[PDB]
Amino acid sequence: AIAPVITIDGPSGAGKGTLCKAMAEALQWHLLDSGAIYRVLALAALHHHVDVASEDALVPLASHLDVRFVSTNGNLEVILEGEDVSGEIRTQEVANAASQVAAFPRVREALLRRQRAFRELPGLIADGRDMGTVVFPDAPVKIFLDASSEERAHRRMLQLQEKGFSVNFERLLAEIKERDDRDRNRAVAPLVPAADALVLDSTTLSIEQVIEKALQYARQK
Ligand SMILES: Nc1ccn([C@@H]2O[C@H](COP(=O)(O)OP(=O)(O)O)[C@@H](O)[C@H]2O)c(=O)n1
C-alpha cells in the first residue's frame, strides 16, 4: 500500500509540538518534527564554522548531514554526528541561525528526500511550516494550527515565568511577530495554509479541545 499522512502546519508557538505528540501516540503512528531538522543543520553549521548567510557553503553540509532521530520512546532524541544534541537544538543561538538557513532554495531541496523518507507504515504525523504545501501536498489530512500573536506571547510568557526567567510582555510580542513576518513573507515556502486544510484557531480553545477536534477531523477522513 502507501502510508497515510496528517500534516500540521502553523506559526511559532501555536501548539504544534504538543498536538503532534498527542496524535502520534493516539494513532500509534510515526512523528516528524521538521523544525528539528533545520535546527540540527544550523547547529552543525555553527559547530563546523560554516557561514549561515551563504547558500554555497550550506549545500555540501545539508547534503551530507549525519543525523538520527531516535525512535520515539516517550521522549525524542536528536543525534548529530553521534552526539545527543536534543537540548542544544532548543537554544536561541540555534533557533536564530535556523531561520537564516531555512530561507535558501537549494538548502531546502537538499532536505526534501530526508523528510519524505519518514513516511512509513502505519502512517506519518508531520509537523512544520510547509508540510501540506510542499513536502506532503498529497497529504490526505491537512491541519493549519494558528492563534493570535498576543495569545501566543502570553503563553510563552507564562512558560518563562514557570522556569523563573524575567520577561515583559512587550518584548515577547515583538519577538513572535518578527518570527511571523519571516515565516510568512518568505519568498520560498512561506507559511500559508493549504487550500484543503482545516484551519484550527486555538486562541480560545484548551489543549484538550484542540486535540479532540484534531482527531475527529482526522478519523472522519
Ligand atoms: N517545515 C519547516 C519547519 C521549520 N522551518 C523553520 O525552522 C526554524 C525553526 O523551526 P521551529 O518551528 O522548530 O522553531 P521556531 O522558529 O517556531 O522558534 C523556523 O525558522 C522555521 O521557519 C521551516 O522553514 N520549515
UniProtKB/Swiss-Prot annotation:
Identify one Gene Ontology CC term for this UniProt entry: cytosol
Q: Name its cellular compartments.
A: Cytoplasm
Q: What are the BP-aspect GO terms?
A: nucleobase-containing small molecule interconversion; pyrimidine nucleotide metabolic process; response to X-ray
List the GO molecular function terms: (d)CMP kinase activity; ATP binding; CMP kinase activity; dCMP kinase activity; guanosine tetraphosphate binding
Q: What is its main location?
A: cytoplasm
Going by the entry's taxonomy, the superkingdom of the source organism is recorded as Bacteria
PANTHER family reported in the protein's UniProt record? CYTIDYLATE KINASE (PTHR21299:SF2), CYTIDYLATE KINASE/PANTOATE-BETA-ALANINE LIGASE (PTHR21299)
Q: Which family does it belong to?
A: Belongs to the cytidylate kinase family. Type 1 subfamily.
Function recorded in the entry: ATP, dATP, and GTP are equally effective as phosphate donors. CMP and dCMP are the best phosphate acceptors.
Q: What is this protein called?
A: Cytidylate kinase
Q: Which organism is it from?
A: Escherichia coli (strain K12)
